[PDB]
Write an enzyme that holds these catalytic residues in place. Structure first.
Site, short mmCIF file in Angstrom:
data_model
loop_
_atom_site.label_atom_id
_atom_site.label_comp_id
_atom_site.label_asym_id
_atom_site.label_seq_id
_atom_site.Cartn_x
_atom_site.Cartn_y
_atom_site.Cartn_z
N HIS A 1 1.15 -1.40 0.06
CA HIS A 1 0.31 0.14 0.21
C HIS A 1 1.24 0.79 -0.21
O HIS A 1 0.14 2.80 -0.20
CB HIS A 1 -1.07 0.18 1.42
CG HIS A 1 -0.85 0.44 2.44
ND1 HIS A 1 -0.36 -0.34 3.98
CD2 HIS A 1 -0.22 1.35 3.12
CE1 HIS A 1 0.68 0.08 4.72
NE2 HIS A 1 0.67 1.23 4.36
N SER B 1 4.24 1.84 8.60
CA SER B 1 3.80 1.24 7.38
C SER B 1 5.13 0.49 6.77
O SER B 1 6.22 1.45 6.69
CB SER B 1 3.44 1.76 6.26
OG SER B 1 3.82 3.04 5.62
N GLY B 2 5.52 -0.13 6.34
CA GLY B 2 6.38 -1.20 5.50
C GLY B 2 7.67 -1.27 6.19
O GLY B 2 8.79 -1.92 6.19
N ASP C 1 -0.33 -7.93 2.27
CA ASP C 1 0.23 -6.40 1.67
C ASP C 1 1.65 -6.25 1.76
O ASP C 1 2.44 -6.09 2.51
CB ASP C 1 -0.47 -5.58 2.87
CG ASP C 1 -0.21 -4.32 2.56
OD1 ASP C 1 -0.11 -3.45 1.90
OD2 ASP C 1 -1.01 -3.53 3.87
#
Ligand SMILES: *[C@@H]1O[C@H](CO[C@H]2O[C@@H](C)[C@@H](O)[C@@H](O)[C@@H]2O)[C@@H](O[C@@H]2O[C@H](CO)[C@@H](O[C@@H]3O[C@H](CO)[C@@H](O)[C@H](O)[C@@H]3O)[C@H](O)[C@H]2NC(C)=O)[C@H](O)[C@H]1NC(C)=O
Ligand SMILES: *[C@@H]1O[C@H](CO[C@H]2O[C@@H](C)[C@@H](O)[C@@H](O)[C@@H]2O)[C@@H](O[C@@H]2O[C@H](CO)[C@@H](O[C@@H]3O[C@H](CO)[C@@H](O)[C@H](O)[C@@H]3O)[C@H](O)[C@H]2NC(C)=O)[C@H](O)[C@H]1NC(C)=O
Lengths: 96, 218
Positions: free
Chosen positions: B41, B173-174, B88
């Site tokens: 994402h 995120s990530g 994801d």
């Protein structure tokens, strides 16, 4: 060139990336709606139908004065109204 | 990271900052000299050519000679579903190979299919918000978390800090979840806002993708 952080929650799920809208020089709420709806579709695959069938689908502007304005993604009576983008601190987009 | 602590400088040399217009937006993990691993994402519909992949960073507010900066050459994905944030995960090929040194090293991954049980102790990390409605951290943060299965999908690894409100937050995120020296997760999403103390944080389950990762990075 004012930057405004926003978040998207759909069915309670909120992706953790840091995302900004980039716009002093007022804009129509419609201009914000277009970007919000496009990013709802672009980031979480939210369709016009998903918005219409949700119990609630809105985005909230938190202003620098501390006030909060709720915009309905179903009905935006304020679409043609204007707002100073530089007055916005953050935007919470919520569909559920 | 909400409720964590500053990491030691370059404690986690596989930790990566992804930047757009000079601003951190997502973390990533160095998994080969010319490949990083992040959340799908993070890059699903962005200006990829403008993304800067920043290795060897610690304090995002200082000029740092330890840094190596790369561009994204290619995006590899595996059944990403943005509606439900399933699978994801993305592998990003760099436009060059990092030089491995004290501040830039590759991470170690688990074996395919390996699942972690309730109670395993892990470390989360990232440059995300230090609080709710906050701003990006300057200094890399870390956080002791515990694997949980309650309120978690089988297609995710979930973690919780028991007894207080702490967790990953926007900008995290990530970023990797490290469990006994191996990267078992990629930070993906929260429920009930950051650091709710109610819903666990959700990570993409790296061990479910290892055969695919290996086929790409050799
Ligand atoms: C892999 O990519 C990095 C990232 O740079 C990207 O930036 C855009 C604009 C594009 O031009 C291309 O360079 C990359 O996609 C490369 O790092 C950059 O490399 C260039 C030239 O080698 C550097 O340009 C120089 O910059 C200074 C001013 O800052 C000038 O005075 C110099 O004359 C020169 O033009 C640039 O600094 C680098 N950018 C960063 C952030 O380090 C990298 O070279 C590239 N590696 C390979 C193997 O292709
Ligand atoms: C908060 O997390 C850190 C680090 O967690 C990461 O590192 C390992 C240990 C593991 O938890 C993993 O899931 C993550 O990869 C904890 O720091 C570690 O603590 C132990 C002792 O408690 C340190 O000692 C080492 O372990 C054995 C026994 O377990 C000892 O006999 C040895 O002295 C050995 O050095 C270990 O070095 C630490 N690891 C790191 C990377 O610093 C920390 O304990 C934890 N905090 C709490 C309250 O649990």
């Amino acid at each position: 060139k004012h930057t405004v952080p926003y978040t998207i929650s759909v069915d309670g799920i909120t992706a953790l990336h840091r995302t900004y809208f980039v716009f002093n020089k007022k804009v129509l709420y419609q201009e914000i709606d277009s970007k919000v709806k496009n990013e709802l579709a672009s980031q979480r695959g939210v369709t016009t139908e998903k918005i219409n069938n949700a119990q609630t689908a809105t985005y909230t502007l938190t202003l620098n004065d501390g006030n909060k304005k709720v915009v309905n993604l179903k009905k935006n009576d304020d679409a043609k109204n204007s707002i100073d983008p530089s007055t916005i601190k953050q935007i919470q987009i919520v569909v559920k | 990271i909400v409720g964590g602590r500053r990491a030691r400088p370059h404690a986690w040399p596989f930790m990566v900052s992804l930047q757009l217009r000079g601003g951190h937006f997502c973390g990533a993990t160095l998994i080969a000299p010319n490949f990083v691993m992040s959340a799908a994402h993070c890059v699903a519909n962005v200006n990829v050519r403008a993304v800067r992949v920043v290795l060897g960073a610690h304090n995002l507010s200082r000029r740092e000679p330890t840094r190596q900066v790369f561009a994204v050459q290619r995006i590899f994905e595996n059944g990403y579903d943005p509606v439900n944030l399933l699978n994801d995960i993305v592998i990003l090929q760099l436009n060059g190979s990092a030089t491995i040194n004290a501040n830039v090293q590759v991470a170690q991954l688990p074996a395919q299919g390996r699942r972690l049980g309730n109670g395993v102790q892990c470390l989360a990390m990232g440059w995300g918000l230090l609080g709710r409605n906050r701003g990006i951290a300057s200094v890399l943060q870390e956080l002791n978390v515990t694997v949980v299965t309650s309120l978690c999908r089988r297609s995710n690894v979930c973690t919780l800090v028991r007894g207080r409100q702490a967790g990953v937050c926007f900008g995290d995120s990530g970023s990797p979840l490290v469990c006994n020296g191996l990267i078992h997760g990629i930070a993906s999403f929260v429920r009930g806002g950051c650091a709710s103390g109610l819903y666990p944080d959700a990570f993409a389950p790296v061990a479910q993708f290892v055969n695919w990762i290996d086929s790409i990075i050799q």
